């Protein structure tokens, strides 16, 4: 992505960055699923 103001991008294929990106992939899948699940609750709750 685009860095926070005072920061610099670590290299790709660096352990710290690989871990970080992994963390982001997982977190964002979770947030997506949750969003949709709450949507479904809305759908059968007849919002």
């Amino acid at each position: 992505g685009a860095p926070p103001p005072g920061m610099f991008l670590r290299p790709a294929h660096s352990f710290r960055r690989l871990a970080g990106e992994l963390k982001r992939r997982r977190a964002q899948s979770i947030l997506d699923e949750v969003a949709r699940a709450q949507g479904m609750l809305d759908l059968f709750e007849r919002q």
Partner: protein, 97 residues
């Protein structure tokens, strides 16, 4: 100056002395090798169930690199080129200015 001179090797030289060191840090051969590891909340412990680029090992010591994300020792060839490039650029700018 006379007392010091140069060092060829770091604090822990060989796999033997590493085993000794590792025990001394308060680690137990059976128990502290048997605790599962976490990769981002996943519990990576399921083995070869997933494909990612990251060394497969229990010890956090396997994942150590510099603060700059660089490893010029024991890094994968990609990591090694990437990191020598990082430092090359940095020093190029330094000695330029």
């Amino acid at each position: 100056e006379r007392r010091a001179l140069w060092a060829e090797v770091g604090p822990i030289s060989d796999v033997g002395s590493a085993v000794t060191a590792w025990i001394r840090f308060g680690n137990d051969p059976v128990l502290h090798t048997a605790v599962p590891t976490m990769l981002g909340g996943k519990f990576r412990n399921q083995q070869r169930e997933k494909e990612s680029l990251l060394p497969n090992s229990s010890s956090p010591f396997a994942y150590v690199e510099d603060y700059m994300g660089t490893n010029l020792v024991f890094g994968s060839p990609v990591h090694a080129k990437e990191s020598a490039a990082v430092w090359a650029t940095y020093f190029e700018r330094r000695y330029a200015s």
